[PDB]
């Protein structure tokens, strides 16, 4: 059949990938990949060794791009007395270095700027193109912790403003406040499902969340910067009393207090309705799908949160989803 999955490493096709596996998760900052390759050795004869510790890796699924490493991040050579001798590879997103590099900011403390203008000066030390589409926020004070990783600080700052931080399929960094809006398939039970497992856990929900935090403006103090900044937000879907209280790490503002509260609400709500599905034959995460599981009564729109392509030498293709409303 027309190859439904092709992979490239620096421009030379991999024709011996005895297995494969791809992942793309919205709740992280970099995708992943894994390829198993058959390797040979003839005693008392020459062998050509590549051992590429770094180079680009590309994966195309059914004539469509599905990953952009940068590649060869890991190289391990399994070996056995019996079955056989093979090799394994691994890869991650282009921002890999942000995930594993301590920041080298020019000075280390902004005077007065916005979040966008800060993320540009952090990422662009390693030449990773940003893809910004969210609303800009003005922050009177920012001071990156000395020596803290790039992953920690971006994740920390984007949590209090309800910014999702995740990669695209091209090699960028996409910061968004909602779904991409790309409508997908109507996954219907009895048509394409192969397995599923729904859930509803009460141990990860709270009816009322409270926040606290002082102000750090140019001149604010006393009761207006100590006791005044408090705000409460409630879910109202849970019918019980499970109070929670949170402390704010930043310059508290009555608008920012609710944004952090909403971010927690979306996280808790999604965590309480996790779903899994398997759809046999092998577009993107964050899409919008319709589902139908009458046995439990699912008739609601869903937004996919994770995606995975897996292959095997014994023809076993599959694909998994981690939907949530």
């Amino acid at each position: 059949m027309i190859k439904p999955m092709r992979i490239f490493i620096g421009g030379e096709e991999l024709e011996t990938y005895t297995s494969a596996r791809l992942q793309r998760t919205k709740k992280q900052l970099t995708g992943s990949l894994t390829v198993e390759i058959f390797l040979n050795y003839v005693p008392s004869k020459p062998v050509i060794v590549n051992a590429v510790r770094g180079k680009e890796i590309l994966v195309y699924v059914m004539g469509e791009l599905a990953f952009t490493g940068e590649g060869g991040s890991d190289v391990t050579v399994n070996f056995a007395k019996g079955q056989g001798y093979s090799v394994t590879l691994t890869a991650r997103g282009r921002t890999k270095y942000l995930v594993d590099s301590s920041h080298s900011h020019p000075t280390g403390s902004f005077k007065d700027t916005s979040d966008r203008k800060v993320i540009e000066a952090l990422v662009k030390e390693h030449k990773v193109v940003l893809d910004w589409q969210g609303t800009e926020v003005k922050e009177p004070k920012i001071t990156l912790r000395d020596g803290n990783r790039i992953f920690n600080e971006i994740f920390e700052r984007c949590n209090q403003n309800c910014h999702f931080a995740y990669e695209t399929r091209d090699g960028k960094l996409l910061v968004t406040d909602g779904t991409t809006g790309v409508v997908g398939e109507d996954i219907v039970l009895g048509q394409n499902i192969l397995d599923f497992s729904a859930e509803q856990s009460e141990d990860r929900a709270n009816s009322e969340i409270t926040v606290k935090g002082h102000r750090v403006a140019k001149d604010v103090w006393g009761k207006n910067a100590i006791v005044q900044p408090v705000q409460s937000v409630a879910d109202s879907w849970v019918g019980a009393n499970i109070p929670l209280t949170i402390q704010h790490y930043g310059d508290a503002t009555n608008e920012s207090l609710q944004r952090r509260a909403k971010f927690e609400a979306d996280r808790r709500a999604a965590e309480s309705k996790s779903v899994n599905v398997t759809v046999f034959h092998v577009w993107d995460i964050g899409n919008i799908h319709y589902v139908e599981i009458p046995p439990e009564g699912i008739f609601d729109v869903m937004e996919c949160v994770s995606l995975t392509y897996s292959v095997d030498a014994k023809s076993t293709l599959e694909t998994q989803l981690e939907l949530a409303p």
């Binding site: 002082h214 006393g222 100590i226």
Partner: protein, 109 residues
């Protein structure tokens, strides 16, 4: 380290006891540090009292009273001294010209 706001100060045998908000942090806080300078501000007056916790124990919290921020004297360059904790024009200054005191009335003895 934490931040709260002053309401009430009372005297005892071994220092001063304060109630400094941040929720009802305590009716009778553990005594406050003096370090030489102290004052007795009126009830519910604008000022802030930082609290330092002995180790990580929430049972001990020494306060650090500060002068009200509306009433901090903008000292001139190369100068320093102490001031009335409720006014910026009744102070004592030790400069390169002379020991300077400022007040509308002087008393001794």
């Amino acid at each position: 380290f934490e931040r709260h706001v002053f309401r009430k100060l009372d005297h005892t045998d071994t220092g001063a006891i304060v109630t400094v908000e941040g929720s009802g942090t305590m009716d009778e806080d553990v005594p406050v540090i003096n370090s030489g300078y102290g004052f007795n501000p009126e009830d519910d007056e604008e000022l802030e009292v930082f609290l330092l916790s002995d180790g990580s124990d929430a049972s001990g919290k020494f306060g650090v009273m500060t002068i009200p921020r509306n009433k901090q004297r903008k000292w001139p360059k190369k100068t320093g001294g102490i001031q009335h904790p409720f006014n910026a024009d009744k102070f004592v200054q030790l400069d390169d010209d002379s020991i300077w005191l400022k007040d509308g009335k002087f008393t001794l003895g």
